[PDB]
Amino acid sequence: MEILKLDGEWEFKAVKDKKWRKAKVPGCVHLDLMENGLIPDPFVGENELEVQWVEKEDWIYRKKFQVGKEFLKYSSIYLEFEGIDTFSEIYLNGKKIGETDNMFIAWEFNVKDLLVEGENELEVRLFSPSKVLEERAKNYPYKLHGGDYSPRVFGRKAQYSFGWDWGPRLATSGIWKSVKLKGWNKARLLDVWVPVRSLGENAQINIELDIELQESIPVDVAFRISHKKPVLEQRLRFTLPEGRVFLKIPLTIKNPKLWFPRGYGEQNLYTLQLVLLDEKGEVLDKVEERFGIRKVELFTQEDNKGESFVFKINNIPVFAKGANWIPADSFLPRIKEEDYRLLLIRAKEAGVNMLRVWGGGIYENDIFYELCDELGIMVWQDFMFACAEYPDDENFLNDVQKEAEFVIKRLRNHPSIVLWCGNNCNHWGYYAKWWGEREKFWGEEIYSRVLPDVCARLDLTRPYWPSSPYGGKDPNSQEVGDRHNWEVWHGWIDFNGYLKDNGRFISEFGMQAPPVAETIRKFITSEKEYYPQSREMEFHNKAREGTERIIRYIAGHFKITEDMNEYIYLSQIIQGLALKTGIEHWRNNKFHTSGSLIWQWNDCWPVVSWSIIDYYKKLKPSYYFVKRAFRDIKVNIEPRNGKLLVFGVNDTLEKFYGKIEYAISTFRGKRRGKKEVDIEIPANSSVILGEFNLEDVDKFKEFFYVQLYNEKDELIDQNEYFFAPFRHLELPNAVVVYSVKEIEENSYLLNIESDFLALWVSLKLENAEWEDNFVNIYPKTKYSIRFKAPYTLKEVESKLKLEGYNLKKVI
């Protein structure tokens, strides 16, 4: 089968304007208007407001294309819109072909008869989603309560696009994925899947083929499964009748090289190569498809305090270190593989087991799931429903089930995908008071019947789980299932309160923090708006009372500041500490609490929000805290009623021997505690390592600390405790003494020592890839923390600045 793809440039105009302007085909209306200069950068200042009219208008896209006489020879031609932003009417040579209800799925159309030779005309009328949805809600028996934007629920589109806590109202339409014209003769591989049927010292496997035959024809399927070198090969023959045929073909892989997530093994991926072909030897459809071999179990077994909730890949239980993933741009077609690659490798090296693809953005581009596959980053896939009362009439349930079929059928092969999730927050929402005392949980049947059944039907390999918080009697309970901890941010509770949360799996929690100055500067329109509570700063904070929350949190541990640059450093470290102090505690429980998923990995535009990496892909400082908090092997401190209580954590398949040091030094002076001999941390477990009573501690002159050494020279982790908020600590300004070695042409090695306790030193260098940063430096220790700068020159990396809570600097 041959593919003429209609990607490239199209012409487009408002439903009723005269001019046809130029447009790009994986596109948005907004993009094309930006490119033609017709509307300002919505991401800048208060331009969101300027551009609300786009949303309200209907739109027409049109391409003219040239088709051969050769090409019409193909006995069937179907037109395939890989993705399309919701509501559309699509005409070919001035004749209808179908509506589209849906952004999240492919739409395919039979056109052989309507096609003519030479020039052709494809016309796509894109309806204002605002207008279309508010009609659909007006027509509906009841009124349904969303959030910001209620009628959102009545259509199948990216729920964030109408505005969120961290997104803006850029409700874009557009042909948001490839448009292919496909021509084929006799038959076509329709789907291919390679489920592991059951596993052991040897691996049993099926190959599930859908095939759509038009004539009743003899066919040969021939395949080769390959790891590095081809492990297996086979040919088979069928004589099948016209229609959709399905086959499960068993086969065996001896000594299977088994997929594991990062840190618990290797990311072995088999490749399947399969050619459908004719009786005459002529190939009809090929398909490469990659897959892994792995068990997944969602261990849900009762105990004292409630019920477990733990992932078990290949029978090893992994604590899920992670973060919630959200669309990387408000206009989706600008995200390039470059971008996904950068955010995901940054996750990898921060030490991330898992990403929850949050059910309010989208089902991702294949590039996302195929990197997650390679990098060992398991994913928690939500079905795209979030924080609202959805419709639940038959007409709708069919649309939903139709999409669920497609989505699963697409993503099934990715060994990274570890769970299917029904929704975000709805069961919690109805069970709590938000959206009222209604008897009908509006949407329940989607979560209860529709989805579990389509999941059970098409994918035995993975657990379905009906809701993003679904912890027992009160869906957010700490006894059963997973938990969303918004006590801390949204309720205002001090972030130390994460210590009193013992939920079986924290799938959501976070703290806000404004981006790096560079990023800030790109969206503020003036230097007069560069102050913490400016119109443009609060306007770029879509959380109801976000800035005053940030300012609250800063004011827990710190002296308030009116200085913009101080505020940024201070607020961003608070973010680190909130995340740190939570992440550390959940890990200290280990399998009582078998998971921590940070509430924001990325941003979809330049905004003050929970994200640990901003829209322009510039690491918040909290990223380095999160790397630290995820260190595969780690020591944490944790109070208990006037007695401190250190911990030891292995996220590794092998027991660890190594020395710890306690202490309780002053900010100058020298320790008041016991250096320890060898300690063991057993494989894949948290262990209590030490106690240390403190019934006469000088809270404002002293601080308890811990350092962890592996069997070699090396510092592998450290940690500290303070007994009073930083602002009251009689903490002398330190002086730090750094120097810079060069290990390989662009790799460097940074050496630091400090007199007194210096805190959160901030290594600034325009394009560096720091292995660690925003660091505490203790008296009596010298630190060798490596980096690189594949940008700057050998003498110019000594134009490196650095700052901290308490400083003077030297060399």
Ligand X SMILES: OC[C@H]1O[C@@H](O)[C@@H](O)[C@@H](O)[C@@H]1O
Which residue's CB is nearer to a second copy, number 183 or number 471? 471
CB of 387 to ligand X, least distance (A): 6
Which residue's CB is nearer to a second copy, number 98 or number 497? 497
- 424 binding ligand X? (CB under 6 A): yes
Q: Which of 13, 257, 312, 535 binds a second copy (CB under 8 A)?
A: 535
Which residue's CB is nearer to ligand X, number 424 or number 776? 424
- 330 binding ligand X? (CB under 6 A): no
Bridge partners for 357 per DSSP:
325, 381
Say how far residue 75 (Cα) sits from the centre of its chain: 43
Contacted by 782, from ligand X, a second copy, none: CB < 5 to 8 Å by type = none
**Spatial distance between the Cα atoms of 355 and 323, rounded to a whole number of angstroms:** 5
User: Which residue, among 718, 615, 716, has the nearest Cα to 661 in the 3D structure?
Assistant: 718
Number of residues that bind a second copy (CB under 8 A): 22
- 549 binding ligand X? (CB under 6 A): no
Spell out, one character per residue from 479 to 518, where the chain touches a second copy: x when CB under 8 A holds, - when not. ------------xx-x------------------------
In the region spanning residues 366 to 395, those forming contacts with ligand X, defined by CB under 6 A, are: 387
- 560 binding a second copy? (CB under 8 A): yes
Which residue's CB is nearer to a second copy, number 345 or number 493? 493
Which residue's CB is nearer to a second copy, number 531 or number 692? 531
Which residue's CB is nearer to a second copy, number 303 or number 548? 548
What tokens were used for 197? Answer: 């049927």
Contacted by 165, from ligand X, a second copy, none: CB < 5 to 8 Å by type = ligand X
CB 668 within 8 A of CB 779: yes
Number of residues that bind ligand X (CB under 6 A): 8
Q: How far apart are the first and last CA of the chain?
A: 67
Q: How many alpha carbons fall within 13 Å on the CB side of residue 502?
A: 8
CB 493 within 8 A of CB 487: yes
- 545 binding a second copy? (CB under 8 A): yes
Phi, psi of 770, rounded to the nearest 5 degrees: -60, 135
**Spatial distance between the Cα atoms of 280 and 277, rounded to a whole number of angstroms:** 8
- 21 binding a second copy? (CB under 8 A): no
User: Which residue, among 333, 432, 340, 326, has the nearest Cα to 386 in the 3D structure?
Assistant: 326
Q: What share of the chain is helix, strand, coil (3-state, %, to 5)?
A: 20, 35, 45
Q: Which of 206, 448, 561, 792 binds a second copy (CB under 8 A)?
A: 561
Q: Taking the CB of residue 742, how many other CB atoms lie within 10 A of it?
A: 11
Please spell the DSSP secondary structure of 346-413, one letter per residue: HHHHHT--EEEE-TTS-PPPHHHHHHHHHHT-EEEEEPS-BSS----SHHHHHHHHHHHHHHHHHHTT
Helix (H) or strand (E) holding 618: none
The amino acid present at 61, given as its one-letter code, is: Y
Q: Which of 101, 123, 165, 329 binds ligand X (CB under 6 A)?
A: 165
CB of 22 to ligand X, least distance (A): 36
Q: Which of 143, 643, 728, 780 binds a second copy (CB under 8 A)?
A: 728
CB of 562 to a second copy, least distance (A): 5
Contacted by 369, from a second copy, ligand X, none: CB < 5 to 8 Å by type = none
CB of 725 to a second copy, least distance (A): 8
User: Which residue, among 491, 628, 613, has the nearest Cα to 553 in the 3D structure?
Assistant: 491
- 688 binding a second copy? (CB under 8 A): no
In the region spanning residues 477 to 506, those forming contacts with ligand X, defined by CB under 6 A, are: 486, 490
**Spatial distance between the Cα atoms of 105 and 467, rounded to a whole number of angstroms:** 22
**Spatial distance between the Cα atoms of 630 and 759, rounded to a whole number of angstroms:** 20
- 530 binding a second copy? (CB under 8 A): no
CB of 705 to a second copy, least distance (A): 23
- 145 binding a second copy? (CB under 8 A): no
Contact positions vs ligand X (CB under 6 A):
164-165, 387, 424-425, 486, 490, 599
Contact positions vs a second copy (CB under 8 A):
491-492, 494, 531-535, 545, 547-549, 551-552, 555-556, 559-562, 727-728
